[PDB]
Amino acid sequence: ASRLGPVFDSCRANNRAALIGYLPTGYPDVPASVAAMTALVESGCDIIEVGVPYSDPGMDGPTIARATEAALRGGVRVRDTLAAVEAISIAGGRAVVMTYWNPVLRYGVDAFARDLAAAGGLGLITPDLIPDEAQQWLAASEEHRLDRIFLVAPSSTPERLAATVEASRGFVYAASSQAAPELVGRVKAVSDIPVGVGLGVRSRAQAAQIAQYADGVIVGSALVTALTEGLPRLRALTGELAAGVRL
Amino acid sequence: EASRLGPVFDSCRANNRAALIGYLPTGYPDVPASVAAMTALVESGCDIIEVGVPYSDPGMDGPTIARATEAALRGGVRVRDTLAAVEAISIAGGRAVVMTYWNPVLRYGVDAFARDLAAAGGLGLITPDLIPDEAQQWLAASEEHRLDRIFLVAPSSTPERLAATVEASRGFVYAASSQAAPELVGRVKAVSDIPVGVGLGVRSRAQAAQIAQYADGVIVGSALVTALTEGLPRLRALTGELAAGVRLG
Amino acid sequence: TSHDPDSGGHFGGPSGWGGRYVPEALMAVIEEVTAAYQKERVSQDFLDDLDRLQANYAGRPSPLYEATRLSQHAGSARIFLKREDLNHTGSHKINNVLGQALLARRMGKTRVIAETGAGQHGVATATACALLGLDCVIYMGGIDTARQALNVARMRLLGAEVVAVQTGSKTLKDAINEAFRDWVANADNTYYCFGTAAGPHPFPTMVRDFQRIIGMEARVQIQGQAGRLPDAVVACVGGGSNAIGIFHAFLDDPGVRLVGFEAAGDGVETGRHAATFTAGSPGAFHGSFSYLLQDEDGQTIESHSISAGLDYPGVGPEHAWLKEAGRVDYRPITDSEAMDAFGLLCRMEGIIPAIESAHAVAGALKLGVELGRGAVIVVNLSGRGDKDVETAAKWFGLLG
Amino acid sequence: IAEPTSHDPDSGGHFGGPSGWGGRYVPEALMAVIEEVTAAYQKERVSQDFLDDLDRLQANYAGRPSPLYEATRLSQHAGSARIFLKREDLNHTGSHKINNVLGQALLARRMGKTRVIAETGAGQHGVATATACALLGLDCVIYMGGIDTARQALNVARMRLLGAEVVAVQTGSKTLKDAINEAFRDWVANADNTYYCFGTAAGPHPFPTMVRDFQRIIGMEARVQIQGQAGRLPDAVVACVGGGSNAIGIFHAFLDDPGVRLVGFEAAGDGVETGRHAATFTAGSPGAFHGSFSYLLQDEDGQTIESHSISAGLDYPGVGPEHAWLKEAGRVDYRPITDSEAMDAFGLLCRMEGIIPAIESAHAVAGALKLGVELGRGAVIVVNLSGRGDKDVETAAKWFGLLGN
Ligand SMILES: N#C[C@@H]1N[C@@H](CF)[C@H]1c1ccc(-c2c(F)cc(Cl)cc2F)cc1
Numbered sequence A: 001a002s003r004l005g006p007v008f009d010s011c012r013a014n015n016r017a018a019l020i021g022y023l024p025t026g027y028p029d030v031p032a033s034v035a036a037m038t039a040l041v042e043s044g045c046d047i048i049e050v051g052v053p054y055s056d057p058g059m060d061g062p063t064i065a066r067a068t069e070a071a072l073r074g075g076v077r078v079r080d081t082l083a084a085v086e087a088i089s090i091a092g093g094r095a096v097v098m099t100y101w102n103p104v105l106r107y108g109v110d111a112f113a114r115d116l117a118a119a120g121g122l123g124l125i126t127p128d129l130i131p132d133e134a135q136q137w138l139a140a141s142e143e144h145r146l147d148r149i150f151l152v153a154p155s156s157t158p159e160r161l162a163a164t165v166e167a168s169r170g171f172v173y174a175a176s177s178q179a180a181p182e183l184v185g186r187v188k189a190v191s192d193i194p195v196g197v198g199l200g201v202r203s204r205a206q207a208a209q210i211a212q213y214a215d216g217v218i219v220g221s222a223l224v225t226a227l228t229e230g231l232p233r234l235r236a237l238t239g240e241l242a243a244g245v246r247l
Numbered sequence B: 001e002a003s004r005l006g007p008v009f010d011s012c013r014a015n016n017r018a019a020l021i022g023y024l025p026t027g028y029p030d031v032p033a034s035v036a037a038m039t040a041l042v043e044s045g046c047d048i049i050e051v052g053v054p055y056s057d058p059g060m061d062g063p064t065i066a067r068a069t070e071a072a073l074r075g076g077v078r079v080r081d082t083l084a085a086v087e088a089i090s091i092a093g094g095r096a097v098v099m100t101y102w103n104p105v106l107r108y109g110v111d112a113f114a115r116d117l118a119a120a121g122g123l124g125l126i127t128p129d130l131i132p133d134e135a136q137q138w139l140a141a142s143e144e145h146r147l148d149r150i151f152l153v154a155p156s157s158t159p160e161r162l163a164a165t166v167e168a169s170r171g172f173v174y175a176a177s178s179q180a181a182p183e184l185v186g187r188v189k190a191v192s193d194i195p196v197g198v199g200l201g202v203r204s205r206a207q208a209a210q211i212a213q214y215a216d217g218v219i220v221g222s223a224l225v226t227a228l229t230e231g232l233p234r235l236r237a238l239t240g241e242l243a244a245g246v247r248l249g
Numbered sequence C: 001t002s003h004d005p006d007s008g009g010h011f012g013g014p015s016g017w018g019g020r021y022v023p024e025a026l027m028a029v030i031e032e033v034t035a036a037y038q039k040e041r042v043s044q045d046f047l048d049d050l051d052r053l054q055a056n057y058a059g060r061p062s063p064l065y066e067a068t069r070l071s072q073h074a075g076s077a078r079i080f081l082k083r084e085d086l087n088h089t090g091s092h093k094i095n096n097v098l099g100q101a102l103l104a105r106r107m108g109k110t111r112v113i114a115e116t117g118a119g120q121h122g123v124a125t126a127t128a129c130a131l132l133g134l135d136c137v138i139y140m141g142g143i144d145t146a147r148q149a150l151n152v153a154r155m156r157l158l159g160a161e162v163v164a165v166q167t168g169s170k171t172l173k174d175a176i177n178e179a180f181r182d183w184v185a186n187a188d189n190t191y192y193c194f195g196t197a198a199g200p201h202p203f204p205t206m207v208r209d210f211q212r213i214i215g216m217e218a219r220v221q222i223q224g225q226a227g228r229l230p231d232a233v234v235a236c237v238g239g240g241s242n243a244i245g246i247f248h249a250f251l252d253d254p255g256v257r258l259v260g261f262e263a264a265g266d267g268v269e270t271g272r273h274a275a276t277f278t279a280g281s282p283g284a285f286h287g288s289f290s291y292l293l294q295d296e297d298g299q300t301i302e303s304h305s306i307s308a309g310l311d312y313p314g315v316g317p318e319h320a321w322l323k324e325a326g327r328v329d330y331r332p333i334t335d336s337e338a339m340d341a342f343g344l345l346c347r348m349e350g351i352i353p354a355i356e357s358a359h360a361v362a363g364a365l366k367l368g369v370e371l372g373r374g375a376v377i378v379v380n381l382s383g384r385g386d387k388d389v390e391t392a393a394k395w396f397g398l399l400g
Numbered sequence D: 001i002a003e004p005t006s007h008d009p010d011s012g013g014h015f016g017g018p019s020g021w022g023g024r025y026v027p028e029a030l031m032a033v034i035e036e037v038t039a040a041y042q043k044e045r046v047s048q049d050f051l052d053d054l055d056r057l058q059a060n061y062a063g064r065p066s067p068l069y070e071a072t073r074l075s076q077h078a079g080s081a082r083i084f085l086k087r088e089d090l091n092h093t094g095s096h097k098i099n100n101v102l103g104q105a106l107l108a109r110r111m112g113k114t115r116v117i118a119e120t121g122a123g124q125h126g127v128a129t130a131t132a133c134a135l136l137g138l139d140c141v142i143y144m145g146g147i148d149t150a151r152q153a154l155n156v157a158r159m160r161l162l163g164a165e166v167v168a169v170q171t172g173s174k175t176l177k178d179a180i181n182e183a184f185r186d187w188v189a190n191a192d193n194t195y196y197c198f199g200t201a202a203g204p205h206p207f208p209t210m211v212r213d214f215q216r217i218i219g220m221e222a223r224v225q226i227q228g229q230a231g232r233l234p235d236a237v238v239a240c241v242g243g244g245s246n247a248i249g250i251f252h253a254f255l256d257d258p259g260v261r262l263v264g265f266e267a268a269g270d271g272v273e274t275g276r277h278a279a280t281f282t283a284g285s286p287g288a289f290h291g292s293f294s295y296l297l298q299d300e301d302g303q304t305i306e307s308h309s310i311s312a313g314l315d316y317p318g319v320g321p322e323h324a325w326l327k328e329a330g331r332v333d334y335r336p337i338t339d340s341e342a343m344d345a346f347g348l349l350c351r352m353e354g355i356i357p358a359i360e361s362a363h364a365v366a367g368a369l370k371l372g373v374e375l376g377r378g379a380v381i382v383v384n385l386s387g388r389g390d391k392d393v394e395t396a397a398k399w400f401g402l403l404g405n
């Protein structure tokens, strides 16, 4: 089974989807970001996406890209992300790391998987790593018992979607009007792996719309904006999002 | 048959002197003021007057003449103003030739310009950018209207072109230029007895005296324009000094 | 096909140079470009269309000139200049954009996007798009659009749109990132005309194949004028397109040295350089595994050079393979060295070189001193320096 | 091989009679160096060693032969005629002018001259001269109007980078025709060691013929290329006409071809009726100017009228004498093109073919489009694209509002 298997299992048994919240390490600073990720656990986040700020995030929207620019300006390091994963685990949370692949290559693919597992991390979301280049990652993924969350797109060919879902473990990230549920149907037609959907969820009503067909609701840009206004707004927005996934 | 300027050099040679040849451009500062200055040159001892036709692109002219002809054209000077100046110089009892680039003459009409200039009392024509190779129309018109043809020779002139240029000249030959000017006159006098005028940036009486030793005529132009810019009293004063310089005894 | 990568785009097998380090959202259009290229790569109608444009439109072949007055400054060696500066648009970049624009119309794409630094590749792309009737959008760093107003108007006169990128450091690196995001969203009707021999498969191979004509011509020309193969072939290396183009025909010649010269800026010891091989390290960047300038965590660091075309933190993966294989050596050339070669080429041969190309000339002078009298060195003069006259005038104090 | 001399002037440099066009309207102080240049050129124009040296420079250094490109996307605007562009824009330095300065600089070396002087309008020929002078170790001095030096700061530095010296002419109207006057005065003083590299097919003998010969390669190449690509001789060969060097260079190979129309297009500025133009043949009259008897813009007294054009290369009050002869003989027709017609063709060639032409060349392109409408579908017109427009981008951008305020 997968490390996140039990997480989605207790979600389906409660007639709800999983709330998956993203936050970048080191925004506005490293201690403040860890305090915010701990707040996500307290406020009802099932899975945490701890993002590694990268200097050239091509797949990141403007809100997240400007927060990782600020975090890098503040001097965030890759090891700071593993410190946040350790803090989230001690607080009873469940955390995966989302990062571009070059920081992993610089760290060492086997060494990063080892230290990520040793910090309590459960998986790795790789937006710019396709299974065709994941030879080293697949080996370290199995050796250290880590989930590998690959991404699929509305433009994925049937041969590539099946191959990408076959290579995934834990859940499949489906990134993008009705193209999001159609993409989820293509995955569920070839495998029974949970599917996460993140299209810029913004309110409680939007979280329920995705939760009608997706196993996990991925929220990222909205949590960063809430954290900019303040920490109390983050737990308030996360509270509204936690109520939407149960509807 | 003798040239129009022939008897002038004969008389100058008899009095043991060189001819003083003065240049002034028509219409500087204005047309009446230049005519008054050309008249003053006759009154002050100029044997021959060079009446310059201002031209928009005068390559052979120095900076003093160039700025003076620019100002004359800004004032709207015309080619016919030069013919009127020749009339005034003839009326004042002087002798005038016209120095001009060839395009104004071509525009006016070569035979027509020779006719009207000869009528106005003109004696000859100085052509700084007309070599004998292009002077077929001009040779015919100068013979028709009894006008002297003053071509130019230079220190760099080949022995063949120098003889051809002297052969083609009537009146006097213009030698335009350390020791280049006397050597140039020696080359002309080695093949002909035609009078030779020397222009050399003459500016004082002593310079005119040096040239009068070996040349038949002393040509002064830039220094006269500079003096006219000061005024007619300064121009009369300078012309008297130059008239004294050409006289050797 | 002897020096080509595998189906995944990897040079050297287990080393893994190149590949496709892109998101899945872009793999459909990349497989579409790879299939289209491998189909037209062997179509005679495509090769005939390209040859007609190269000859009648771009001015190929470019000449090979022996700069005899440079010899006394190159240790009495013999410097031959591959005159890519005489191409249409003024550089070797016209070779790449003619092949990709022809391919884009074979694919049915109606829109072409391209990155650019100070404007050379953007002008070339707009030139090819106007020629073939393609909608063209150029992405340019906001810092570059502010001080390159005439190159912008140049692309604008050619009928292309120009977008100033204000994200990131607002330069060439960030313009590529923005064209990437554009291509992800518009891959149905848009083709990405990349400007150098990097990026994901098949772009490093495809661009090299389009630049191969430089080396093929230069190898025929040098044997005709000198009677033998050269002792060395040198070129400047930014992303690597003009270098790999002239290097490729000589790869299997045992006696021919291949030296690429990269921008060292103020010096490699100063952190204000662009020497990717001299001071960089392997990593994944812009869709390929190659060398780049990065810090201890793998973040892209800023590059500095008086050249615009060599002001790039990365380098093509096939060059990283040739460096590992020991076939090509890569040496640094500083700003000062390049400008001395710039002015020397102006005073000695009357050729005003692109400041990028002057790095190759400067390295050729140093290499001619090493090899001695009579040595034959072919130098790829990638571009002309009309775009750089103002920069060079300030350098020598001829302005004021 | 030395090409024949069927259309040459007489020994005095006169076209169509011993009192026809051309000749030498220069002072005697200059005839020594002109007879020296004439003798040197007549010896070298038939020297196989000289023609080999020039061919070697034209091929490996200048980039010749230039291609002949059929601008298919222009046909719709040219009455469905077929427009072929002689791509002189691809020459080294970017214009046909490199053909002229290479031969004359080689000739200056053959003569033992060590110093070369030249005029320039907005900088194009001065850069070309300085280029050849750097290549052949000659000292270079460029004369340029003070108005043009202040307005063309980069071309001055371009010439200094090439090792040349620039002198600002602050006399007269301070432009092209006054830089020529200053270079002429320099030659009279330094003829012993100085060669005057004149920039067009005008001036005294032998310069109209010599400049024409160094540009005849354009027409020789084009006449072969047009037969290979079109299968027949063209219906018309056209080119822009400033002084006339690029036009006469492409015209010459087609002179004895009976059915090939020859049309030169001159700059009409704001319009021939507005007095702000440079249409020498259209609004000028015969006269002697800059050493030759030809056509020039002059008033009733024979004074030179200032010329105006949005292009700097066609901004010249005169024209070469061999063109005046070909006009009188009826071989070549000369038609005007305004600033707007040229800029319209400038932008069209940019959008349709990706070629940014020199504004001088845009006049020829504009006239080719008009000629294509007159000649109709299928007509084959060869256009001399005399230069590239990188120098004219700033002017064209202001014209099309691409710079704003
Ligand atoms: N994920 C991701 C990354 N954000 C940046 C750094 F890796 C972004 C990126 C991805 C791809 C490219 C790319 C390119 F440069 C050229 C071509 Cl032809 C195709 C491409 F797909 C560029 C930047």
Ligand SMILES: N#C[C@@H]1N[C@@H](CF)[C@H]1c1ccc(-c2c(F)cc(Cl)cc2F)cc1
Pocket (backbone or CB within 6 Å): B057, B058, B059, B060, B128, B129, D025, D026, D027, D030, D180, D181, D184, D196, D198, D202, D203, D204, D207, D288, D289, D290, D291
């Ligand atoms: N006299 C007289 C005239 N002052 C101006 C008008 F004609 C001056 C002049 C004379 C000659 C030339 C000339 C030239 F343009 C090119 C060449 Cl190659 C040789 C030349 F000699 C130019 C201007």
